[PDB]
Amino acid sequence: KVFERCELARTLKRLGMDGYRGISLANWMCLAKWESGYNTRATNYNPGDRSTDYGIFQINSRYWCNDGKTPGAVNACHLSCSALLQDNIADAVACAKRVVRDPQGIRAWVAWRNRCQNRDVRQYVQGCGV
Numbered sequence: 001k002v003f004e005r006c007e008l009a010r011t012l013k014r015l016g017m018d019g020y021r022g023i024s025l026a027n028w029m030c031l032a033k034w035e036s037g038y039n040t041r042a043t044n045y046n047p048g049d050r051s052t053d054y055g056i057f058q059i060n061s062r063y064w065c066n067d068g069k070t071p072g073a074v075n076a077c078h079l080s081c082s083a084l085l086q087d088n089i090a091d092a093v094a095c096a097k098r099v100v101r102d103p104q105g106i107r108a109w110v111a112w113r114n115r116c117q118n119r120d121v122r123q124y125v126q127g128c129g130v
Contacts, residue, residue, distance in 0.1 A: 001087040003038040003056075005029070006128035013130045015093045021100045028096075029124035030116035031109055032056050040092070041085050055084035057096045058109070064095055 003011070009029055012018070018025040035058035036042035044053040051062040051070045061070040065081035077095035084092050099108055106112050 001040050003032075003040075005033075005038070005124070006130075008032065008038055009125050009128040009130045011089065012093070015090065017093060017096075018130070020097055021105060023100060023106050024121075025130055026121040026123075026125045027106060027112070027116060030119070030121045031106070031112050033124060034111045034115045035109065040087055040089060043085070052081065054081045055092045056089060057084075057092055057099075058111075059084055059092070059095055059099065064099060 009025060012025060012028055017023070017028045032038050035053075036056050038056065040056045042053075042055060042058065044058060046052065049062065051060050051073065052067055053060055054065060054067075059065060059077070061067040061081050062073045064075065064077045065079045065084055066073070066075040067081040077098050079091055079095060084095065086092075100106055102108065107117075
Protein backbone atom coordinates (compact mmCIF):
# COMPACT_ATOMS: atom_id res chain seq x y z
CA LYS A 1 0.00 0.00 0.00
CA VAL A 2 1.13 3.58 -0.62
CA PHE A 3 0.18 5.69 2.41
CA GLU A 4 -0.84 9.32 2.13
CA ARG A 5 1.30 11.61 4.33
CA CYS A 6 -1.21 12.51 7.08
CA GLU A 7 -2.77 9.02 7.11
CA LEU A 8 0.67 7.61 7.95
CA ALA A 9 1.40 10.25 10.60
CA ARG A 10 -1.83 9.37 12.45
CA THR A 11 -1.10 5.65 12.12
CA LEU A 12 2.43 5.99 13.51
CA LYS A 13 1.17 8.15 16.41
CA ARG A 14 -1.37 5.46 17.34
CA LEU A 15 1.38 2.83 17.22
CA GLY A 16 3.36 4.81 19.80
CA MET A 17 6.25 6.08 17.65
CA ASP A 18 6.14 9.73 18.76
CA GLY A 19 9.23 10.15 20.95
CA TYR A 20 10.09 6.44 20.90
CA ARG A 21 13.62 6.23 22.31
CA GLY A 22 13.79 10.04 21.89
CA ILE A 23 12.75 10.10 18.22
CA SER A 24 9.99 12.53 17.26
CA LEU A 25 7.19 11.58 14.89
CA ALA A 26 8.48 13.99 12.19
CA ASN A 27 11.79 12.07 12.14
CA TRP A 28 10.01 8.76 11.52
CA MET A 29 7.98 10.46 8.76
CA CYS A 30 11.14 11.87 7.16
CA LEU A 31 12.73 8.40 7.26
CA ALA A 32 9.73 6.62 5.62
CA LYS A 33 9.47 9.31 2.99
CA TRP A 34 13.11 8.97 1.86
CA GLU A 35 13.41 5.23 2.30
CA SER A 36 10.28 4.09 0.43
CA GLY A 37 8.01 6.99 -0.55
CA TYR A 38 5.61 5.64 2.14
CA ASN A 39 5.38 2.33 0.22
CA THR A 40 4.95 -0.86 2.26
CA ARG A 41 5.78 -3.20 -0.62
CA ALA A 42 9.11 -1.58 -1.54
CA THR A 43 12.10 -3.92 -1.74
CA ASN A 44 15.68 -3.04 -2.69
CA TYR A 45 18.37 -5.65 -3.29
CA ASN A 46 22.00 -4.69 -2.43
CA PRO A 47 24.22 -6.58 -4.92
CA GLY A 48 27.20 -5.45 -2.89
CA ASP A 49 26.53 -7.63 0.15
CA ARG A 50 23.61 -9.81 -1.02
CA SER A 51 21.12 -8.37 1.49
CA THR A 52 17.68 -6.84 0.78
CA ASP A 53 15.87 -3.83 2.32
CA TYR A 54 12.18 -4.40 3.03
CA GLY A 55 9.03 -2.34 3.43
CA ILE A 56 8.20 1.17 4.44
CA PHE A 57 11.30 1.64 6.58
CA GLN A 58 13.60 -0.36 4.25
CA ILE A 59 14.76 -2.71 7.06
CA ASN A 60 17.82 -4.81 6.16
CA SER A 61 17.90 -8.57 6.03
CA ARG A 62 21.49 -8.82 7.27
CA TYR A 63 20.41 -8.06 10.85
CA TRP A 64 16.71 -7.61 11.32
CA CYS A 65 14.50 -10.10 9.50
CA ASN A 66 15.07 -13.54 7.99
CA ASP A 67 14.84 -13.99 4.20
CA GLY A 68 17.02 -17.15 4.22
CA LYS A 69 19.13 -16.01 1.26
CA THR A 70 21.35 -13.47 3.01
CA PRO A 71 24.69 -14.97 4.05
CA GLY A 72 25.75 -14.77 7.67
CA ALA A 73 22.63 -12.83 8.65
CA VAL A 74 20.75 -12.60 11.92
CA ASN A 75 17.06 -11.91 12.62
CA ALA A 76 16.96 -9.54 15.60
CA CYS A 77 13.26 -8.74 15.05
CA HIS A 78 12.45 -12.45 14.98
CA LEU A 79 10.34 -12.13 11.83
CA SER A 80 10.22 -13.42 8.29
CA CYS A 81 11.14 -10.47 6.01
CA SER A 82 7.74 -11.17 4.33
CA ALA A 83 6.19 -9.64 7.45
CA LEU A 84 7.64 -6.27 6.40
CA LEU A 85 5.77 -6.21 3.10
CA GLN A 86 2.22 -6.28 4.58
CA ASP A 87 -0.23 -3.37 4.12
CA ASN A 88 -0.67 -3.41 7.96
CA ILE A 89 2.55 -1.87 9.40
CA ALA A 90 2.27 -3.16 12.98
CA ASP A 91 5.09 -5.68 12.47
CA ALA A 92 7.27 -3.18 10.59
CA VAL A 93 6.81 -0.65 13.43
CA ALA A 94 7.66 -3.24 16.13
CA CYS A 95 10.85 -4.03 14.16
CA ALA A 96 11.74 -0.36 13.61
CA LYS A 97 11.43 0.06 17.40
CA ARG A 98 13.87 -2.84 17.85
CA VAL A 99 16.39 -1.27 15.41
CA VAL A 100 16.51 2.01 17.36
CA ARG A 101 17.03 0.18 20.66
CA ASP A 102 20.66 -0.36 19.46
CA PRO A 103 23.24 2.38 20.26
CA GLN A 104 23.07 4.08 16.82
CA GLY A 105 19.35 4.81 17.34
CA ILE A 106 17.85 6.42 14.20
CA ARG A 107 21.36 6.94 12.75
CA ALA A 108 21.29 3.28 11.75
CA TRP A 109 19.64 4.41 8.47
CA VAL A 110 22.10 6.42 6.38
CA ALA A 111 19.23 8.06 4.51
CA TRP A 112 18.19 9.61 7.87
CA ARG A 113 21.61 11.28 8.16
CA ASN A 114 21.60 12.44 4.55
CA ARG A 115 18.07 13.74 4.39
CA CYS A 116 16.70 14.34 7.86
CA GLN A 117 19.41 15.07 10.40
CA ASN A 118 19.67 18.72 11.33
CA ARG A 119 16.87 19.71 8.90
CA ASP A 120 13.54 21.38 9.56
CA VAL A 121 11.42 18.18 9.52
CA ARG A 122 8.20 19.91 10.68
CA GLN A 123 7.02 19.77 7.07
CA TYR A 124 6.35 16.04 7.24
CA VAL A 125 3.66 16.33 9.92
CA GLN A 126 2.29 19.84 9.25
CA GLY A 127 -1.50 19.86 9.26
CA CYS A 128 -1.98 16.16 10.03
CA GLY A 129 -3.55 16.80 13.45
CA VAL A 130 -0.86 14.82 15.29
